[PDB]
């Protein structure tokens, strides 16, 4: 088809970032779920997974796999990734930072209950000290809308993504950094971001525990 | 300076892929090491890593964090990352998963040992049922002597690269891939290779009980 065909679970997961990316870029994307593991092996078997694993995006001919190497493709696509090799580069380095923060955010369902509130201490310390504090510097230093070079690019959208799912685990956390108060703000408003933050857009719901017991079942972890 | 300058630990750690590359690209770099946490701490009072971390890499008048960030700009600029957006899309693929296999490599050291035994076990079923047998697949598809595009790429490199820690960790392993062998020896060949794997190069050892007590005291983990 002439649609990006989206293979995961129904869940908010690895997916997720490129669901808001095709979304910022005001893409429509089909998306077919994996019900059971049924299902993740008849895809393995078809020789559609490179590395046995998903997320899996089927785009412009392709059977992308791997997370970044999905991303870079889209964001390379409809030009949210910097006009030249030195915007790339701090692109890249804004958002690696991002997904670093990000991926101690992902894990913390599948935690040890006994780490849990040291995990959650640690990941709510780097965020105060270390990360916000970074991004928001950034925006104080050229003063403009965007993160790089002036215009919107993925590294606005990682970012604001990254705010929501901050703002669920604290409120409180965002209010000393109003440049990212800001920004939240602005991105949310661009007319594909909002319509993707609406009900019923294929924006997927912070994980429980029901979906966790259904997914480690499927994929096993 | 006009060479880049390598903040690091006098370690393999995160910093020798980058290290792998830059060589393969026949550029000269000098290296900072990082000796005691007074060093480390110097830096991020000085304002050098955007993310209090490392590697950090002084190149083209920017201070690059983050090693994908790096990986990226290294690659680009020296015209090692394919000719165009699908090409780059394929590389992205193959070095991400081989980014992954070898982040369990790498970790290796610091596992508990009860666990030991098992993680290198783990390791050595997905290099031999799921990740060679990728590559090799790919090779013996195309019947050519690079992995992406007939040219010499940083899919190349970074493959090479891990099927040397892989040979480290059982030379038995790679037999039944005949053309990852081709591969290794051809790229192994190469002028600009071949002078990085001489002794005296600023290639790194594998890493021992030694260095790692020092390590995990300055970057304290
Ligand atoms: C919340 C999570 C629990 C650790 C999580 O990040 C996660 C990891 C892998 C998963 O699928 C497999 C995949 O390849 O992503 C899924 Cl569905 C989730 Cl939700
Ligand atoms: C062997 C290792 C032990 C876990 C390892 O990969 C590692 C991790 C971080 C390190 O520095 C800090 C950094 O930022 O990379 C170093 Cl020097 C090493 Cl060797």
Redesign the interface.
């Known amino acids: 088809a002439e649609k990006p065909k989206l293979h995961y679970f129904n869940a908010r997961g690895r997916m997720e970032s490129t669901r808001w990316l095709l979304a910022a870029a005001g893409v429509e994307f089909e998306e077919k779920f994996i019900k059971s593991a049924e299902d993740l092996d008849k895809l393995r078997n078809d020789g559609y997974l ?3 694993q998903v997320p899996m995006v089927e785009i ?1 001919g ?1 059977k ?6 999905i991303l ?2 889209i964001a ?2 409809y030009n949210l990734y910097g006009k030249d ?2 915007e ?3 692109i ?2 804004y958002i ?2 991002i997904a ?1 923060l990000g991926e101690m955010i992902l894990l913390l369902p599948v935690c040890p209950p006994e780490e849990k509130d040291a995990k959650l201490a640690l990941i709510k310390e780097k965020i105060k000290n ?2 916000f504090p ?1 991004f928001e510097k950034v925006l104080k230093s050229h003063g403009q809308d965007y993160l790089v070079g002036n215009k919107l690019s993925r590294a606005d959208i990682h970012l604001v993504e990254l705010l929501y799912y901050v703002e669920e685990l604290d409120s409180s956390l965002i209010s000393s950094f109003p440049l990212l108060k800001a920004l939240k703000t602005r991105i949310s408003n661009l007319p594909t971001v909002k319509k993707f933050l609406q009900p019923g857009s294929p924006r997927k719901p912070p994980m429980d525990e029901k979906s966790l017991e259904e997914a480690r079942k499927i994929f096993r972890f």
């Not at 992308?64 to 190497?69: E, I, N, P």
Request: net charge positive; proline share 0%; glycine share 4%.
């Open positions: 490179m590395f046995q412009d392709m992308l796999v791997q997370t970044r190497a870079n493709y390379s696509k090799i030195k790339r580069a701090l890249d380095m690696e930072g670093d270390r990360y970074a």
